Amino acid sequence: HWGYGKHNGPEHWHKDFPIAKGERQSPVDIDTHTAKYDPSLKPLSVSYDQATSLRILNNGHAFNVEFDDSQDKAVLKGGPLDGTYRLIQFHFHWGSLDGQGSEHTVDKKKYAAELHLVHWNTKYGDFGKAVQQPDGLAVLGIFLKVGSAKPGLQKVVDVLDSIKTKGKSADFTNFDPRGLLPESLDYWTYPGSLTTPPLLECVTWIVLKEPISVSSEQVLKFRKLNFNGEGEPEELMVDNWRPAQPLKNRQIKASFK
Numbered sequence: 001h002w003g004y005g006k007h008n009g010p011e012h013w014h015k016d017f018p019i020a021k022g023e024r025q026s027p028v029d030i031d032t033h034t035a036k037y038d039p040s041l042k043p044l045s046v047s048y049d050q051a052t053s054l055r056i057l058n059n060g061h062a063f064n065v066e067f068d069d070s071q072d073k074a075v076l077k078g079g080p081l082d083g084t085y086r087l088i089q090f091h092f093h094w095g096s097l098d099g100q101g102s103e104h105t106v107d108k109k110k111y112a113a114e115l116h117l118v119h120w121n122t123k124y125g126d127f128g129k130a131v132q133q134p135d136g137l138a139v140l141g142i143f144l145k146v147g148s149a150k151p152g153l154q155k156v157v158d159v160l161d162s163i164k165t166k167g168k169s170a171d172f173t174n175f176d177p178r179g180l181l182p183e184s185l186d187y188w189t190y191p192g193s194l195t196t197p198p199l200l201e202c203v204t205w206i207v208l209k210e211p212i213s214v215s216s217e218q219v220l221k222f223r224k225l226n227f228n229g230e231g232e233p234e235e236l237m238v239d240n241w242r243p244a245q246p247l248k249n250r251q252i253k254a255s256f257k
């Protein structure tokens, strides 16, 4: 099955998931010079004050911090979006070295990691019906650079040793995702896809311009997780990023001058 190694990595995924070579695949390189300012975009609204985290899961590709999405609680709206999108989970993609790890790139620059806050369009009722639609998801992408620690990340980092291997989960209540956001909500946006199989083309991407800083010790702890299950040969969970895909017939719009 799919993964990020030599025999099952991104260059193989098209055989099981032909949409890998589709018309609106993600991630992409964001050419900042050619991303046009769009004065019709609204400011983004991130309303996370009532977010209810439940659990943290090592799914064998990343760790997901899961939310109760059964009520109207942690929503993204405004910006490029029509309607209301509800937070379901976040996770990260990261590198084996600080010089790589992000999926989107900015003028070919790779950041050390990328945070994805995944939301589904509430007009479709739940996540599973939303991934059957071209406007079913909105993913808020936030770059991570290595420098100062992010204090709001530390509760996540401390729980990782309890979910080292694939299939492990842990209770993870009362985590506030507002502590992972940068000061500015200036963003780029374009239509694209999930960046892991099943690679579905559902996503309005909203990628913030301002990265957050995490410490080298925080990202080192991400790199101690495992892609394998307990009792299987240890393969460190590193380099779980897909490289940039062809832009094709798409425009990237900027919310800022």
Ligand SMILES: Cc1ccn(O)c(=O)c1
Pocket: 116, 118, 139, 194, 195, 196
């Ligand atoms: C639903 C989904 C699956 C994989 N990734 O990376 C995402 O950002 C979102």
Ligand SMILES: [Zn+2]
Pocket: 091, 092, 093, 116, 195
């Ligand atoms: Zn992701």
